[PDB]
Amino acid sequence: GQQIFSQALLNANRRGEAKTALAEVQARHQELLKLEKSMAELTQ
């Protein structure tokens, strides 16, 4: 005769993968921007 709650904790899981889903998009993004710049010159 009593009753219980529950809680959450965010675990390295996100400490890494979610921060990586910023760093690893913008950085591959940096590679893609470089590609785009080179293609622009090539097309010219």
Partner: protein, 217 residues
Amino acid sequence: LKSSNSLRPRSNAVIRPDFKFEDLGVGGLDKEFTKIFRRAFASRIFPPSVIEKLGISHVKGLLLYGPPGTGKTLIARKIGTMLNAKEPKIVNGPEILSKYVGSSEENIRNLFKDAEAEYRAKGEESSLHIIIFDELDSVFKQRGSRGDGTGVGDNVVNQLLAKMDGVDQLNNILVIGMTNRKDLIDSALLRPGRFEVQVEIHLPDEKGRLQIFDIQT
């Protein structure tokens, strides 16, 4: 639209003057309908000018109580779905409790955002909103009483108190509750400004029985 002079009761009336109490389909109760419709749905028909010169804010609460199987939910339903307003946000009795440390009270907070948003955005011309608590007497019990050994029986009531009448105003809502035992609801919920009009619904008299029979068949 825009009327230079001689404006209407309401460009988009909630009751819409083609209305009479023989259309609802609830027999018997007749004085109750009069008192309810006068105390609540009378201040939302007159032109905004006179009401604004009168400075009276519309009543934002309705309580129906009575024995089992008398017609309460019928009234709630007909009021919900025979008007000109946004759709009701129904909640059943213990539909609010949630698992984690902070989800029930967040759920209670969730119910008001569209109303505050539209009131903030527009003001006095926001359409009415309605939210119906079913079987109010399940969770909202007197604070400090035996039971709810867990610390929920207070926080839930607390959030609702703070949210119906707080430092930030709001006057485009109408909340209705239904129950069989009004002696257990918290006392601070039954003051003017929170659930103002209370109505008992009793067993029918004989003529009312004749009315109900004619309504059913």
